[PDB]
Design a protein around this ligand. Structure first.
Ligand SMILES: *Cc1ccc(C(=O)N2CCC(OC)CC2)cc1
Ligand SMILES: *Cc1ccc(C(=O)N2CCC(OC)CC2)cc1
Ligand SMILES: [Ca+2]
Ligand SMILES: [Ca+2]
Ligand SMILES: [Cl-]
Ligand SMILES: [Cl-]
Ligand SMILES: [Cl-]
Ligand SMILES: [Cl-]
Lengths: 227, 9, 227, 9
């Protein structure tokens, strides 16, 4: 997308979201990132939404095929699961490449740095979901380290009701439960996150209250499932 | 277990 | 897909449908067609379902973008609508190419020949939906001619309740209403199709009855919208 | 106006 204006890439990413063309959206935001300028709050959301949708569809397909493959155990089901798995890994590597070159190192504000580190944890978590071989433990630790650095910054620099801080804790708790085989850590994190946000709600406007309580409900939904 | 849906913005 | 076995392409097309990976599905069925053997009834359905889903998503996106473009009237909305439009035209041309080389000419049975000619009418209709310039009338006539030949065969060779005959009449009526600006022809076709199927239902088994009445309900839904 | 949905088979 080197020949398109940055502002045109951003405008087309918003159009692609409206058209539910998330592969296009991701390619447009990849091009915008590669212009080399930092991303605004809205632009970070566009980047995240685009790739979350793309990899979300790949993960859903991988799970369908992995389930069929397990029930069977010719080569076709394994081959096609491997094909989807390789395409998912390629998308995850692309996102992680954008974060590493050079979104994270140029992110100085707490809101941008935590946002990108949460992203890094998420895409290593997606890699961990399909990993089996010599690198599954290293992939898991890469997810944990990214989430942990984001947690440390968010606790120092953001209020307990901040939606990015809340969504980071939500996803780190899912990491603990689904990936790290640490369900007690998952439950403790979700509960402490929920309780500290509840005690901070009194400080918020009506619109901020709606933003925070929406993510608190996701924490509560998981706790209900886990306890 | 639900992560951030993060599919709309 | 030249190096994959025909049977493996078919098996992977079924897996892709289960995974809702319709672009993969279409590529697998394109490869199966290009093996050069005729397609079974089930294989024809797989081909049709795959491309209907792919072009269905493109049409939905084109309509979103066309609507935004009309409300605006920079170049970005028009450029991105043109990009989606070109990709849709490419898919339609690919399907029409498969029908022309050489599915239709090798289709001797009424069920296969009508199925492929209905397909031909549908993909020219999709081309007509986005056409404006020097070829819109010729594209419309190509759709009409394909549908008409399919109608003539189906009326001679199939019972009035045959699901392919019913779906052909349904889509030809939509062609009349939406493309040819002939709503009276659309209404007359849907009504005569419905009434002649109703009078033939007594001949059917319980399972055939369910198949036919499902498509009759689609005809009735359109008549309710059009009258 | 609805055509054949034809999205499942
Ligand atoms: C990971 C994550 C956490 C929270 C949100 C969220 O709910 N936001 C609300 C508004 C938006 O700006 C318009 C910021 C993020 C999203 C993702
Ligand atoms: C264009 C079209 C018309 C009818 C159908 C349909 O309903 N079918 C039912 C069963 C199927 O075989 C399993 C044949 C088609 C589909 C498309
Ligand atoms: Ca510039
Ligand atoms: Ca062979
Ligand atoms: Cl494959
Ligand atoms: Cl900076
Ligand atoms: Cl474009
Ligand atoms: Cl033949």
């Amino acid at each position: 997308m080197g020949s398109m204006e940055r502002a045109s890439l951003i405008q087309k990413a918003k159009l692609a979201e409206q058209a539910e063309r998330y592969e296009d959206m991701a390619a447009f935001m990849k091009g915008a990132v590669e212009k080399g300028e930092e991303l605004s709050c809205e632009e970070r959301n566009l980047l995240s939404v685009a790739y979350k949708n793309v990899v979300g569809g790949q993960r859903a397909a991988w799970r369908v095929l992995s389930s069929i493959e397990q029930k069977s155990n010719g080569p076709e089901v394994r081959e096609y699961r491997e094909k989807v798995e390789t395409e998912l890994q390629g998308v995850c590597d692309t996102v992680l490449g954008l974060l590493d070159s050079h979104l994270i190192k140029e992110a100085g504000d707490a809101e941008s740095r935590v946002f990108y580190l949460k992203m890094k944890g998420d895409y290593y978590r997606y890699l961990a979901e399909v990993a089996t071989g010599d690198d599954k433990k290293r992939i898991i630790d890469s997810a944990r380290s990214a989430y942990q650095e984001a947690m440390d910054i968010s606790k120092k620099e953001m209020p307990p009701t901040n939606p990015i801080r809340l969504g980071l804790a939500l996803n780190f708790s899912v990491f603990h439960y689904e990936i790290a085989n640490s369900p007690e850590e998952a439950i403790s994190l979700a509960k402490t996150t929920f309780d500290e946000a509840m005690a901070d709600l009194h400080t918020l406007s009506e619109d901020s209250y709606k933003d925070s309580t929406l993510i608190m409900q996701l924490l509560r939904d998981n706790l209900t499932l886990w306890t | 277990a639900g992560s951030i849906p993060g599919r709309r913005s």
